[PDB]
Ligand binder design. Sequence first.
Ligand code: MET
Lengths: 306, 306
Amino acid sequence: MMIITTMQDAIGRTPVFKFTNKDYPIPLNSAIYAKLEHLNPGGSVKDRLGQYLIGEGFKTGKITSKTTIIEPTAGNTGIALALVAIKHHLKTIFVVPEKFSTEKQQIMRALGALVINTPTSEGISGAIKKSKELAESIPDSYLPLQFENPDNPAAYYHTLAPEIVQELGTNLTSFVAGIGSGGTFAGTARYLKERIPAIRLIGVEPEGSILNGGEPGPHEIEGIGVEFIPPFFENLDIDGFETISDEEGFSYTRKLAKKNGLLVGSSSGAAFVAALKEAQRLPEGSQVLTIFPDVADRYLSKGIYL
Amino acid sequence: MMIITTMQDAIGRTPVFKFTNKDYPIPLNSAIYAKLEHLNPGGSVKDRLGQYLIGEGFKTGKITSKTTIIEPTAGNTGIALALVAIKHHLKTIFVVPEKFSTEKQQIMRALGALVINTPTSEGISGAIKKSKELAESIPDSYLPLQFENPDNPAAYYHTLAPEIVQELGTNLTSFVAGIGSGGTFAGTARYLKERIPAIRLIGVEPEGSILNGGEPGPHEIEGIGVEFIPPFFENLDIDGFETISDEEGFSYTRKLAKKNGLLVGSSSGAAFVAALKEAQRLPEGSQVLTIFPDVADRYLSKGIYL
Ligand code: MET
């Protein structure tokens, strides 16, 4: 491999898992390609976001040696920012709704971050509000606000999307990806659409998310789901959103481990189910791309694998 | 990176982290290189053992298509064997003392293994006894018994050690590694000694292990420690053993996360402190190799980072 002097040097260049009709009920000569972002050193796709936000921040002068980074997060963005902050010894404060993965919060604190909790029932919106309060009261603070910052999708446009095309070329029928903030989906989709105008775009949410108009509500699937429509979707021709039940998402999370040796989180299982439904509706020979965002190990304290 | 159809394709080719006097009290022009085996897809160095045992088993006829693999394990070897078994659809049975490592047992089961528990107070020896009973009573079984099988050190001799010399060359002063069964240390040391006759060999154990003549007793560090001499050391010229207290091992586990963004187990922290002591006693310009065996994530329920 390589000799590294920073864990930042290990971010990206992740493999792609190829699934065919020999693995799962998929049409003849069709394939699903899953970009394995869980193999990042921070254990999620958000490692790329962290690296990009801090890197660009130093270039624009939004981040200096004096800066405290404050961000609301479900966990992974916090881990990624804390990991990347180490090289420049930046202080970090993450606002996390309480019952999101305790493992992720432990890891954030292990990396030197302060973790402040908000109530689970105010969701991510409550975390955003609280993060804004802290920033006003902390000198030299910087609030990336992944939920609205166009640098969120741009991170993936510039890092993850080029890697996909480098490995897979332009022979893709569809791109299917879970939506939380919407950055991964929107940034990657923009890049693919520029090179593959005919590609189909499917966003994936759990039951109790609002993208298909349904009522908001709790869901065991963690990492995806929106409480507000992401602002990153305006220039995008999205073909549909796929709503995945907890039962189905966890079922395919368990199958990915048992059948394929992939130890991925419930948001990966959800994305995979959505990719299987998309492959099943397309002609033979279709090539469907998805992303597996994070590792299963941060959810062992919950049901995952039961 | 690559397109893979089995998670086995992703075993090995791990990076090496280089530490200098910028990071820790290491003499001028000296360095510590840590082979990052925690980044294997099963989360540990044992992935190499699993891959080797199954590969060679097919080669010698010890394993065929409807062999059942049986092994007593306190976790990582079970994960590795279960992960590798998937490709060839082999069934696996692991005998694990109840209360040894829950997270690791969950992962074993997730990968398709049957996990059978023994009493905690009978320790690993109770698991070994029970595993022996199963093997006799199951036709076409295979019972590696890693703790006495010479194929344990051979795995590292053939896989890990050549990879290290390809990346780092022959300018190594010392090899410092934790001892559980002793396979990693013995296999790697044999190969390094052949290529680098002057290399120093230091085995690492926690307090309450017996290699430096201390009294046997429990230790919170997980994965390393012996209550008796491993049978793998007969033809090794070992320079010393380093006994690491739980306080020191856990302290350096926390430092690796906080200072370096490395999320590694307590046996990595222990190895690292031993490597730091070794670097500190050698001339300027010395190059010390160590191995970080596994990921921190499987120990968050045990307060690894408190
Ligand atoms: C977009 S939320 C930020 C963190 C990541 N979504 C997680 O699940 O931890």
